[PDB]
Design a protein around this motif. Structure first.
Motif, PDB file in Angstrom:
ATOM      1  N   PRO G 478       0.960  -1.377  -0.022  1.00  0.00           N
ATOM      2  CA  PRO G 478       0.097   0.058   0.034  1.00  0.00           C
ATOM      3  C   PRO G 478       0.937   1.376  -0.107  1.00  0.00           C
ATOM      4  O   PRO G 478       2.039   1.269   0.278  1.00  0.00           O
ATOM      5  CB  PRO G 478      -0.835  -0.091   1.188  1.00  0.00           C
ATOM      6  CG  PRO G 478       0.062  -0.884   2.211  1.00  0.00           C
ATOM      7  CD  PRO G 478       0.961  -1.742   1.266  1.00  0.00           C
ATOM      8  N   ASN G 479       0.130   2.377  -0.270  1.00  0.00           N
ATOM      9  CA  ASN G 479       0.772   3.467  -0.199  1.00  0.00           C
ATOM     10  C   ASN G 479       0.209   4.435   0.658  1.00  0.00           C
ATOM     11  O   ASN G 479       0.995   5.560   1.241  1.00  0.00           O
ATOM     12  CB  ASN G 479       0.620   4.422  -1.601  1.00  0.00           C
ATOM     13  CG  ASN G 479      -0.807   4.125  -2.079  1.00  0.00           C
ATOM     14  OD1 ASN G 479      -1.976   4.231  -1.516  1.00  0.00           O
ATOM     15  ND2 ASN G 479      -0.836   3.739  -3.543  1.00  0.00           N
ATOM     16  N   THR G 480      -0.872   4.436   1.543  1.00  0.00           N
ATOM     17  CA  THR G 480      -1.460   4.940   2.441  1.00  0.00           C
ATOM     18  C   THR G 480      -1.911   6.570   2.006  1.00  0.00           C
ATOM     19  O   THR G 480      -2.516   6.792   1.143  1.00  0.00           O
ATOM     20  CB  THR G 480      -0.914   4.886   3.692  1.00  0.00           C
ATOM     21  OG1 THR G 480       0.329   5.593   3.707  1.00  0.00           O
ATOM     22  CG2 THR G 480      -0.718   3.491   4.130  1.00  0.00           C
ATOM     23  N   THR G 481      -0.687   7.271   2.634  1.00  0.00           N
ATOM     24  CA  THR G 481      -0.874   8.816   2.119  1.00  0.00           C
ATOM     25  C   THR G 481      -0.372   8.926   0.696  1.00  0.00           C
ATOM     26  O   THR G 481       0.463   8.251   0.242  1.00  0.00           O
ATOM     27  CB  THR G 481      -0.068   9.609   2.878  1.00  0.00           C
ATOM     28  OG1 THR G 481       0.529  10.434   2.291  1.00  0.00           O
ATOM     29  CG2 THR G 481       0.798   8.826   3.797  1.00  0.00           C
ATOM     30  N   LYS G 487      -5.752  10.412  -7.145  1.00  0.00           N
ATOM     31  CA  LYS G 487      -6.634   9.291  -6.521  1.00  0.00           C
ATOM     32  C   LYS G 487      -8.075   9.535  -6.949  1.00  0.00           C
ATOM     33  O   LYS G 487      -8.833   8.439  -6.906  1.00  0.00           O
ATOM     34  CB  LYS G 487      -6.575   9.461  -4.896  1.00  0.00           C
ATOM     35  CG  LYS G 487      -6.758   8.093  -4.259  1.00  0.00           C
ATOM     36  CD  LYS G 487      -6.852   8.356  -2.871  1.00  0.00           C
ATOM     37  CE  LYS G 487      -7.013   6.816  -1.954  1.00  0.00           C
ATOM     38  NZ  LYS G 487      -7.988   6.725  -1.218  1.00  0.00           N
TER      39      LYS G 487
END
Ligand SMILES: CCCCCCCCCCCCCCCCCC(=O)OC[C@H](COP(=O)([O-])OCC[N+](C)(C)C)OC(=O)CCCCCCCCCCCCCCCCC
Ligand SMILES: CCCCCCCCCCCCCCCCCC(=O)OC[C@H](COP(=O)(O)OCCN)OC(=O)CCCCCCCCCCCCCCCCC
Ligand SMILES: CCCCCCCCCCC[C@H](O)CC(=O)SCCNC(=O)CCNC(=O)[C@H](O)C(C)(C)COP(=O)(O)O
Lengths: 156, 173, 459, 128, 172, 86, 606
Positions: G478-481, G487
């Protein structure tokens, strides 16, 4: 029923055999245009315009509507070349040259413009993946028996 | 275990111990319990049937063994009697050598899947041991063609042999 | 090995003294019996061949051919049931004699232990087939058909004979076992390259090779129905079986001057396949597709890679079968319509559905669809060629372009499509056609499950 | 104006676009009668024999077997070794062959330039 | 035969709005257009010497062809559509009725009895239908692909069998 | 698709002629032949042919589309085209 | 250990059972369509039992139940790669097949070959799920042609149609072009890595698989219908709408791309090899979605929006995302099955009509299919908490923030907008607009079985990934932020995809003559691509097969050089040596010079 005459003989040089060969292919005398005679092997056979079997009238009471054939009428040397399943010679709404220009013009744009992006990709302004244990090289296939110089990082 | 680990080494069996802190009845376990009772037990009794009826008569087989013959090296040139044995012996060794890379391949095959993503290091010895098998297999047999022969195998073996023997002399400096 | 030879030798008194009605009933009922007798020859050792006597022996290479020939013999019997019913009884007995004598010469040829004994029985087979092709043929050109057949095969056969006796006077024996154990490198002298040319061009001619292939289109097309299958199924493959046998002493010159042949096969296989897609005669298609597959196995022997010898045997039997159903099928349309033009008869499943079922599975068999041994043998050739040269794939990959481009093409214009409303001749399928269809294709899926026996000696 | 369509070997100019078919002339009007008559008899000798209950066989087309003989048999009895035929045979026969020879001879020796002083990978190639 | 203005502009008007309805899709728009091409089609139905009548016709076809809907609508059951020649797979000739197996012949007895009398009237009227056709045939065979009728008494309209016994358009 | 009948399929087309505001509802007849019994000639007929075709589904061939002109001789063809004996 | 393998191996066994009853003809005609329906249904419900093992345990395992032969060092064996990729693909696949073939029997109901059809579907799964379970690459190839030659048979369900037979030709041709690289990969694998097992191929750690992945990329181009070998799906639609829905929506086209994700351990190893995947995938999405922007049918748009999608999963592996590709195909089948399912319902309800411009008011007259089409487009057009969220939203964001070429990104946002664009274009022409069907009113869906089949797949089309979102382990990094603009681009690109179609839909509402333009034709005739590729190259090569093949070389040239010329030579100088004058004088005159040449010229005495 079929002895010798119907099969192609020589190229009908003279007008007399021109008419006989026209009768041989049960066509008219005036519309008979035999194939060009230069080491070609066709001889009696006439030039047939590029009219595919898909192009012929689909509303006609053809004896063989499979490729829209009838009984007795002459047949193209390359008949099986242009039949409904195979290649077709039929009119299109817009010129073949136009396809050539768009098809070339269309496809040529990407690999050109995609060549440009080969130098200029897109990403996010995010640093590399600093990794523990000399960057997986202990367990990333690489042999650790030889000195695996530990590349370690710190939270900046 | 009709086989044995000395030829077929397999990783030890380590299983976890689930602690269902949740409340929902675990459907997976119930599927097993019904499966062993409904499926295993009847076919097991049929399997228990085939045991003692196979036990009321057990004819034995024995291994087929061949005495090692004099090789083509001591086989006389252009001789046809003792060429037969040495040519036979080499071809059995050819068939033998295919089945051991096969065995290492089968050992290689099991090593990865049974060790998951950890096979990258868990097969490190398994990967290395194949390379010495394969490279030595090539030195035993390579570029021999469909009509391979014990003479041609020795010709290749000789061809490599003086090349390294001369190289060793050159390496002496 | 006289287990199989003698009962076939005796089969001539059998058919000749049989009664008026049975003859064919007699001919089949015992030719099947000989077939399972020949099915015994599936007993191979590892590498030491089955040496039955001083003059007769067999190996893992010969045995699949023997079973193919012996089991074939009933098939042309039932196949010829329709075509030759009108003829009197005496010639009926004579025709069966030609078939039995042909299979007789085939089984000894594949099983000879001395090279010249193979050669004498190699070209001994054209004598009966010349009778079959010329006498019992149908169309007029059959006269020139036979001349093209024998003269092409002989034009290379005699150079082999001169070469063979030379090896006899040089080494002292042409026997397979002795020549294999005492195999010596064939040097690069101009004398030796012509010796290689002599010992290869004989099989290359009836391989065939691109350019040296005219006989099959001028023979198989006008050959009698029985004669046509036998030529393509097995009489193609004497050169092949010989080829892997004589290639034990031609080294290393083979790896140096096989390039013109590897050339002519590779371009030819695409060329033959492409022209196969552009014939108006369906019978020419199986003929032209046959050489296309056949050109593939010449590539196998030239590289002489173990993997190449793998598929050489498998494709040989696979194609040897493959041509058989298609010729049987192409026959079934013929006498019903008395023409071999695919255009005349289209969409036969609307009239003969079961015939269509047989037609398509034989076609997909020609496609080399795995697990059928057609692909696996053909595939092993690809792998050996890639080992020889990685580039090789594209030219042969072009062969996996044209095959299905034609191998389903007659389907969609013979068994598939609509029907012309003028042919009321087309009738129901006599059970013979489907029955022989069954013995023709059902094997190929059967030994597909177990490919090791027909894989070849390189197991 | 507007885009203009052009004839082609496969994208032939439509009859609707060609004004030549629209050139009504006495020669064409009188010509159509003959094709109408010859097709009429062909339709007639198709239907009678087809619709005949006695015709239990196959009604052959004379044009059919003229074509089959033409496409295969008549070639060489009418063939003439013109210079262009030799050239086409050269660039479709020996020509393409030499293409494969030069490309296949090259990489083969290019491979042979690799093995001898050990610069080729054979880590797994044990199935020669 | 040859095509004359009436046959040809009727051909024109068929395709023209077939493009137009496919162009507009919704009925009402094409409705206003189709009826105004009608006025546009009669806006000149008085032209002088046929050369202009042909020349304006030439202008009609060219603008038609580039006004031809490149993807026009074709009804599937007609040539060019989805259902075109779709049921020819189920099409099967009538002579397969003859070679029916006797055990199966007795399983459809009435239908085979009716085919017996249908092929009966085929044979008893074939020879009379053809002999009358040849005598009434003008010299040089037929001058067109026409068919004479059963104009006389107690006869069948010649060359009727196949077209009377044509397979149904939905053989299913 | 139902067991389509000629009676049902023609009463569909007699609607189109009575839905033809030009073809008056009183001017309706099973033999209303357009150019001389009605007056709407070939040009004033071919668009109706497409109109019925648009509502019929089938496309009557052009050789007789312009020709089958009297309502009964048209509905004879849908009887032929559907080939139903009712 | 005791469970898992034996259960799914039964699944392969149990739906093969309908086939060898069919050959034995133990089926009583109409029973077979329902009979196979049942067997496939339990084949589903049993397939979840191995699935449940994966959610809890997560273990995978390979079975080798048979050994075919041993090619010296290569022992070909019946090896099955049974894993998460294998096990979870099972239930989604055949439940989709079970869902569609019910809609088939309602649709396909008049042709007396119902059984012949239904078995043809039955063996179709057999070849499919053996590809996803196969371990040795040979077994994968067996199923590779197995679907290919069977699509030929299935799309050729009606031999009356010659276009169908024509359509199968390029379908096999383009598929054959793909499997050349499969052979090339096979050839490379058998020489270099000398193996066939997928597990063996990756575990050798072939970190330079240039030629193989070139072959596998070529293999996808045919099977997954990438650029070049795209138009076979625009050809395969001729096959019945059910089977077209069954095969050419998302069920066997994904096999080609699934092949790359199977090869993921070595697929992404070479960074360059990844690059032209993004290149091949991007051009499909631009081209295919462009074609669907104007399509007067209800089949081409779905197929193009698939081929646009098939141009996205391999983009994720192009940016080193195997599982994100893998979940994409699962949702791909979930909604694309429906889009064809409801479309075929229009073709059945409204009598054999496919083009958009022949029917209107389908909202009120066709409510359930309207709802199904709404959600199916809603599912595909990236909408949160459905198929689009876990798959389409995830992929758009993933390629957006991962390292990728700018245009590889650019097509995805454009194509996703186009997917949102023509989805509403057909929704409009379907429902929004006055009825355009013949006065004879026959449109209906009251058939419960069609209604049932829709709702059994409805739960998939709205729930989809959520049922398995947290169930499947996270293989995605994941990249989260991350920045918020790209996005939400997926939700941005949807909205102007809508009203641009809406205003153009209102141009069809607007009473005005819309002039023809190149753009409308360009989209409808696939950019005029089949107008040349299906016409130009095949005409030239096979015309060469007429002249250069037979007339020039074979029938004349090779037959001129050796046979005719040499036979002529025998014939030519025979009469010079055979025919002689016969007068006695010349004969002994000939004897004269023979004496001297023997005595003098060569002088045999010397
Ligand atoms: C020992 C043998 C060698 C020495 C003894 C022989 C010496 C003389 C050799 C030439 C003899 C005369 C040749 C006559 C001739 O060519 O006539 C024209 C011949 C015969 O022409 P034609 O009469 O067939 O022409 C008409 C053709 N039809 C029937 C279709 C209308 O020309 C040709 O055959 C075509 C040109 C020559 C083609 C062959 C050349 C290449 C050979 C390749 C194979 C080589 C092995
Ligand atoms: C964020 C937004 C990104 C851009 C989105 C662009 C597409 C928007 C949606 C377009 C929907 C088009 C549509 O309605 O298609 C059906 C319609 C049918 O038209 P019809 O009623 O038959 O009348 C005209 C023909 N005679 O068709 C028409 O009326 C013609 C409409 C043409 C649409 C072309 C779409 C192409 C878009 C990609 C171009 C790529 C170029 C490279
Ligand atoms: C999308 C739209 C495309 C199309 C529009 C847009 C493109 C074309 C524009 C120009 C159209 C053109 O003016 C008219 C055309 O179509 S054609 C020629 C009509 N004029 C004649 O042929 C003169 C002779 N007249 C007759 O032959 C009879 O009067 C007739 C048969 C017409 C009626 O007979 P009546 O029924 O007995």
């Amino acid at each position: 029923h079929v002895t010798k005459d119907m099969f192609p003989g020589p190229y009908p040089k003279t007008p007399e055999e021109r008419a006989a060969a026209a009768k041989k292919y049960n066509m008219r005398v005036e519309d008979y245009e035999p194939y060009p005679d230069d080491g070609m092997g066709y001889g009696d056979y006439p030039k047939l315009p590029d009219r595919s079997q898909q192009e012929r009238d689909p509303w006609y009471d053809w004896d063989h509507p499979d490729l829209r054939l009838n009984w007795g009428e002459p047949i193209h040397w390359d008949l099986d070349m242009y039949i409904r399943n195979r290649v077709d010679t039929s009119p299109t709404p817009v010129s073949w040259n136009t396809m050539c220009k768009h098809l070339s013009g269309f496809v040529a744009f990407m690999l050109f413009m995609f060549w440009v992006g080969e130098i200029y990709p897109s990403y996010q302004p995010v640093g590399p993946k600093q990794y523990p244990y000399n960057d997986l090289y202990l367990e990333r296939g690489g042999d650790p028996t030889k000195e695996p110089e530990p590349v370690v990082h710190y939270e900046i | 275990d009709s086989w044995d680990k000395d030829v077929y080494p397999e990783p030890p069996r380590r299983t976890p111990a689930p602690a269902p802190q949740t409340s929902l009845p675990n459907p997976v376990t119930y599927l097993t319990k019904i499966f062993d009772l409904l499926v295993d037990r009847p076919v097991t009794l049929a399997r228990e049937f085939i045991e003692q009826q196979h036990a009321k008569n057990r004819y034995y087989y024995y291994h087929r063994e061949f005495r090692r013959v004099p090789d083509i090296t001591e086989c006389e040139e252009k001789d046809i009697l003792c060429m037969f044995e040495a040519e036979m012996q080499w071809r059995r060794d050819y068939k033998v050598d295919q089945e051991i890379v096969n065995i290492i391949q089968e050992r290689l095959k099991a090593c990865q899947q049974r060790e998951g993503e950890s096979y990258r290091q868990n097969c490190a010895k398994e990967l290395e041991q194949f390379t010495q098998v394969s490279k030595a297999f090539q030195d035993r047999y390579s570029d021999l063609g469909a009509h391979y022969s014990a003479r041609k195998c020795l010709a290749k073996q000789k061809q490599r042999m003086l090349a390294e023997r001369k190289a060793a002399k050159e390496a002496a400096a | 090995m006289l287990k199989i030879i003698i009962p076939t030798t005796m089969l001539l008194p059998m058919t000749w003294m049989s009664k008026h009605n049975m003859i064919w009933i007699n001919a089949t009922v015992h030719s099947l019996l000989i077939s399972l007798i020949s099915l015994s020859l599936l007993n191979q050792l590892g590498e030491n061949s089955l040496n039955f006597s001083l003059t007769f022996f067999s190996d893992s290479l010969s045995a699949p051919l023997l079973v193919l020939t012996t089991w074939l013999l009933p098939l042309m019997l039932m196949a010829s049931q329709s075509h030759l019913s009108k003829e009197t009884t005496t010639r009926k007995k004579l025709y069966i004699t030609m078939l039995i004598l042909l299979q007789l010469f085939l089984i000894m040829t594949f099983t000879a232990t001395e090279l010249i004994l193979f050669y004498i029985l190699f070209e001994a087979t054209l004598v009966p087939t010349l009778i079959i092709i010329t006498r019992w043929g149908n169309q007029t050109e059959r006269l020139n058909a036979g001349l093209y057949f024998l003269f092409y095969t002989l034009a290379g056969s005699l150079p082999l004979l001169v070469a063979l006796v030379y090896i006899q006077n040089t080494t002292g024996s042409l026997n397979f076992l002795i020549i294999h154990y005492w195999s010596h490198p064939l040097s690069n002298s101009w004398s030796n390259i012509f010796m290689w040319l002599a010992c290869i061009m004989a099989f290359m001619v009836k391989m065939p090779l691109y350019g040296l292939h005219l006989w099959l289109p001028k023979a198989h097309v006008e050959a009698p129905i029985a004669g046509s299958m036998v030529l393509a199924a097995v009489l193609l493959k004497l050169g092949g079986y010989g080829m892997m046998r004589i290639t034990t002493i031609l080294n290393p010159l083979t790896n140096y001057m096989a390039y013109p042949f590897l050339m002519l096969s590779m371009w030819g296989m695409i060329m033959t396949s492409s022209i196969c897609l552009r014939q108006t005669d369906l019978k020419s298609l199986i003929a032209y597709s046959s050489v296309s597959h056949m050109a593939l196995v010449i590539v196998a022997i030239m590289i002489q890679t173990p993997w190449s010898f793998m598929g050489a045997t498998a494709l040989m039997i696979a194609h040897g079968l493959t041509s058989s159903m298609l010729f049987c099928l192409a026959n079934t349309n013929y006498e019903r319509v008395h023409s071999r033009t695919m255009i005349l008869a289209r969409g036969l499943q609307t009239l003969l559905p079961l015939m269509a079922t047989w037609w398509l599975m034989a076609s997909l068999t020609n496609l080399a669809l795995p697990p059928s041994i057609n692909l696996i043998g053909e595939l092993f050739i690809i792998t050996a060629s890639f080992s020889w040269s990685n580039i090789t794939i594209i030219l042969m990959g072009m062969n996996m372009m044209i095959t299905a481009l034609y191998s389903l093409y007659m389907l969609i214009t013979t068994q598939r499509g609509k029907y012309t409303h003028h042919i009321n001749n087309i009738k129901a399928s006599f059970t013979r056609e489907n029955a022989l269809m069954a013995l023709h294709i059902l094997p190929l899926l059967l030994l597909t499950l177990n490919p090791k026996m027909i894989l070849g000696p390189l197991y | 104006s507007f885009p203009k369509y052009k004839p082609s070997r496969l994208a032939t100019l439509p009859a609707t676009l060609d004004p030549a078919e629209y050139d009504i002339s006495p020669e064409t009007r009188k010509a159509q009668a003959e094709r109408l008559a010859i097709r009429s008899r062909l339709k007639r000798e198709y239907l009678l024999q087809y619709n005949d209950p006695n015709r239990l066989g196959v009604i052959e087309d004379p044009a059919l077997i003229r074509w089959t003989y033409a496409r295969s048999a008549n070639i060489y009895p009418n063939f003439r070794p013109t210079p262009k035929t030799s050239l086409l045979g050269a660039l479709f026969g020996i020509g393409p062959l030499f293409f494969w020879y030069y490309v296949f001879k090259t990489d083969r020796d290019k491979k042979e330039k690799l093995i001898q002083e050990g610069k080729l990978d054979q880590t797994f190639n044990i199935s020669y | 035969a040859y095509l004359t203005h009436q046959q040809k502009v009727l051909r024109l008007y068929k395709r023209a709005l077939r493009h137009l309805e496919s162009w507009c899709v919704h009925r009402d728009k094409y409705r206003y257009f189709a009826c105004l091409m009608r006025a546009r089609f009669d806006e000149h139905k008085n032209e002088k010497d046929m050369v202009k009548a042909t020349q304006l016709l030439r202008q009609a076809e060219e603008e038609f062809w580039y006004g031809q809907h490149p993807q026009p609508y074709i009804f599937p059951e007609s040539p060019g559509g989805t259902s075109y020649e779709r049921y020819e797979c189920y099409k099967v000739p009538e002579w397969c009725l003859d070679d029916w197996h006797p055990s199966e012949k007795a399983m459809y007895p009435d239908y085979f009895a009716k085919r017996e009398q249908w092929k009966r009237l085929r044979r008893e009227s074939w020879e009379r239908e053809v002999k009358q056709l040849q005598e009434e045939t003008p010299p040089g065979g037929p001058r067109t692909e026409a068919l004479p009728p059963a104009r006389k008494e107690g006869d069948l309209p010649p060359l009727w069998w196949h077209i009377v016994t044509r397979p149904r358009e939905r053989p299913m | 698709a139902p067991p389509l009948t000629l009676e049902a399929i023609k009463d569909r087309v007699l609607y189109v002629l009575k839905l033809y505001d030009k073809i008056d509802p009183e001017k309706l007849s099973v033999n209303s032949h357009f150019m001389k019994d009605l007056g709407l000639d070939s040009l004033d007929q071919v668009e109706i042919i497409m109109a019925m075709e648009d509502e019929f589904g089938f496309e009557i061939p052009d050789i007789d589309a312009e020709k089958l002109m009297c309502p009964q001789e048209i509905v004879d063809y849908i009887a032929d085209k559907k080939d139903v004996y009712e | 250990m005791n469970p898992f393998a034996s259960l799914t191996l039964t699944t392969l066994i149990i739906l093969t059972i309908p086939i060898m009853m069919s050959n034995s003809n133990i089926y009583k005609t109409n029973l077979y369509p329902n009979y196979v329906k049942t067997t496939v249904s339990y084949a589903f419900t049993l397939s979840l039992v191995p699935l449940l093992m994966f959610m809890h345990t997560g273990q995978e395992m390979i079975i080798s139940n048979w050994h075919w032969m041993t090619l010296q060092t290569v022992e070909l064996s019946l090896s099955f790669k049974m894993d998460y990729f294998s096990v979870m693909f099972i239930p989604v696949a055949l439940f989709v097949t079970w869902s569609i073939m019910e809609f088939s029997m309602w649709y396909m109901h008049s042709d007396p070959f119902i059984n012949r059809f239904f078995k043809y579907l039955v063996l179709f799964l057999i070849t499919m799920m053996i590809l996803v379970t196969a371990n040795n690459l040979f077994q994968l190839f067996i199923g590779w042609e197995g679907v290919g030659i069977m699509s030929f048979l299935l799309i050729g369900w009606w031999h009356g149609r010659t276009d169908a037979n024509t359509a199968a030709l390029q379908a096999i041709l383009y598929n054959r072009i793909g499997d050349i690289g499969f052979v090339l990969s096979m050839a490379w694998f058998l020489t270099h890595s000398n193996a066939w097992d997928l597990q063996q191929i990756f575990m050798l750690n072939n970190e330079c698989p240039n030629m193989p992945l070139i072959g596998l990329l070529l293999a996808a181009a045919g099977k997954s219908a990438q650029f070049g070998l795209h138009p076979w799906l625009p050809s395969a639609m001729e096959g019945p709408t059910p089977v077209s829905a069954l095969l050419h929506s998302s069920t066997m086209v994904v096999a080609g791309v699934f092949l790359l994700i199977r090869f993921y351990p070595l697929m992404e190893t070479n960074k360059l090899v990844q690059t032209m995947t993004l290149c091949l995938g991007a051009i499909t999405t631009l081209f295919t979605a462009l074609c669907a922007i104007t399509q007067n049918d209800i089949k081409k748009i779905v197929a193009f929006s698939t081929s646009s999608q098939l141009g996205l999963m391999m983009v994720t592996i192009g940016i080193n995302q195997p599982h994100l590709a893998f979940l994409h195909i699962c949702m791909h089948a979930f909604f694309k099955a429906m889009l064809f399912m409801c479309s075929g319902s229009i073709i059945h309800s409204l009598n054999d009509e496919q083009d958009i411009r022949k029917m209107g008011g389908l909202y009120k007259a066709m409510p359930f299919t309207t709802t199904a089409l709404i959600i199916g487009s809603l599912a595909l057009t990236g909408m949160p908490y459905l198929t689009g969220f876990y798959s389409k939203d995830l992929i758009i964001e993933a390629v957006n923030m991962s390292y990728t070429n700018a245009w590889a990104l650019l097509m995805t946002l454009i194509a996703t907008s186009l997917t949102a664009a023509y989805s509403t274009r057909i929704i409009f022409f379907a429902f929004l607009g006055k009825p355009r069907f013949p006065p004879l009113v026959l449109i209906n869906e009251n058939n419960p079985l069609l209604i049932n089949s829709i709702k059994r797949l409805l739960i998939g089309s709205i729930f989809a990934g959520f049922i398995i979102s947290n169930n499947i382990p996270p293989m995605t990094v994941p990249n989260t932020t991350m920045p918020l603009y790209m996005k939400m681009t997926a939700l941005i690109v949807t909205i102007m995809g809508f009203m641009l179609a809406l205003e153009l839909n209102n141009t069809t509402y607007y009473l005005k003559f819309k002039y023809p333009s190149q753009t409308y034709k360009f989209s409808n005739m696939l950019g005029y691509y089949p107008s040349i590729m299906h016409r130009l190259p095949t005409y030239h090569n096979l015309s060469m097969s007429q002249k250069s093949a037979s007339s020039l070389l074979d029938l004349i040239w090779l037959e001129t050089i050796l046979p005719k010329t040499t036979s002529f030579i025998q014939m030519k100088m025979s009469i010079m040596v055979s025919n002689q004058k016969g007068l006695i004088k010349l004969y002994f005159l000939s004897f004269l010079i023979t004496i001297m040449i023997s005595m003098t010229l060569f002088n045999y005495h010397e």
